[PDB]
Amino acid sequence: GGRLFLHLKRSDNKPVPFGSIVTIEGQSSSSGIVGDNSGVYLTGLPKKSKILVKWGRDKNQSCSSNVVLPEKTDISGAYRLSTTCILNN
């Protein structure tokens, strides 16, 4: 599958909080954890995914992102991608 470093930034231009939990939309278990440079490393992904990034239970404490990988198959490396995490408010 696809592996990538994903740099997330909130729609309000703040970094995503260090320690936020990343999940595939529709799944309850963790996929990864946002680190101290507001990035996460993810593997086993299809070409197009949707993720939830969460650091609390209230309004404006989670955000949603699409994750679109380039088409190329059969490579061993990792993409360095960026996307917006749109706040759920």
Curated annotation (Swiss-Prot):
Domain of life according to the entry: Bacteria
Disulphide bonds in the chain: C63-C85
Membrane-traversing stretches: none
Subcellular location: Cell outer membrane
Family: Belongs to the fimbrial export usher family.
Function recorded in the entry: A probable role in capsular biogenesis. It is likely that the caf1A molecule binds F1 antigen subunits during the extracellular secretion process.
Protein's UniProt name: F1 capsule-anchoring protein
Full-protein residues shown: 745 to 833 of 833
